[PDB]
UniProtKB/Swiss-Prot annotation:
Transmembrane segments: none annotated. Residues 23-44, 71-94 bind DNA. The chain holds residues 3 to 145 of 289 of the full protein. This is Right origin-binding protein. The gene is rob. Transcriptional regulator. Binds to the right arm of the replication origin oriC of the chromosome. Rob binding may influence the formation of the nucleoprotein structure, required for oriC function in the initiation of replication. Residues 6-104 form the HTH araC/xylS-type domain. It comes from the Bacteria.
Length: 143
DNA sequence: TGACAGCACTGAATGTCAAAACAAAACCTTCACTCGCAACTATAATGGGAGCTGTCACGGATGCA
């Protein structure tokens, strides 16, 4: 029912990292590999399988732009199979070399796909301002 | 009744043949200069000890004489 898929993503957003998962591992959620896939297609508007590894790449794209690791820390970190295939699907998502992607300081959100909620989404508000050069005092350290 | 389990097949999306380029310094030319050899200079000059070291002490030694 509608209470299932919402609870599956509470697993899945927390288990987008730890299990090396395809839909066979996702088939342990009450029904078969196809029926859990059939139950997702209409209650969401997204198609689960190519989305998740792309969402796990979208989890890896912010890891490719704001985390301090090289290509092979994050080659198979997000449960992938190869690096050149990971480089390949990246071209169909961001149209940029990952060496070129962390070359430019500008980070545009083209291929990052948002995390899905079947329940109610807490929408933040926006207001566009233009700020001023203000002196302060503080120290720096890294992570 | 509607879930509920599994099949039919697209195909985008992999797993392989190739280069494509970029810094990596790595080994390597370079090319001007800094950093070193070597020789000469023509009034006249001509013999150390460089300070040192001062009585221990019985004992065996070899060679001189």
């Amino acid at each position: 029912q509608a209470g299932i898929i919402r609870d599956l993503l509470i697993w899945l957003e927390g288990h987008l990292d730890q299990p090396l998962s395809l839909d066979n591992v996702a088939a342990k959620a009450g029904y078969s590999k196809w029926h859990l896939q059939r139950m997702f297609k209409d209650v969401t508007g997204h198609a689960i399988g190519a989305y998740i590894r792309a969402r796990r790449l979208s989890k890896s794209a912010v890891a490719l732009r704001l985390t301090a690791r090289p290509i092979l820390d994050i080659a198979l970190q997000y449960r992938f199979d190869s690096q050149q295939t990971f480089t390949r699907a990246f071209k169909k998502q961001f149209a940029q070399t990952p060496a070129l992607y962390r070359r430019s300081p500008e980070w545009s959100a083209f291929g990052i796909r948002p995390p899905l909620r079947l329940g109610e989404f807490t929408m933040p508000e926006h207001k566009f301002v233009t700020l001023e050069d203000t002196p302060l005092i503080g120290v720096t350290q890294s992570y």
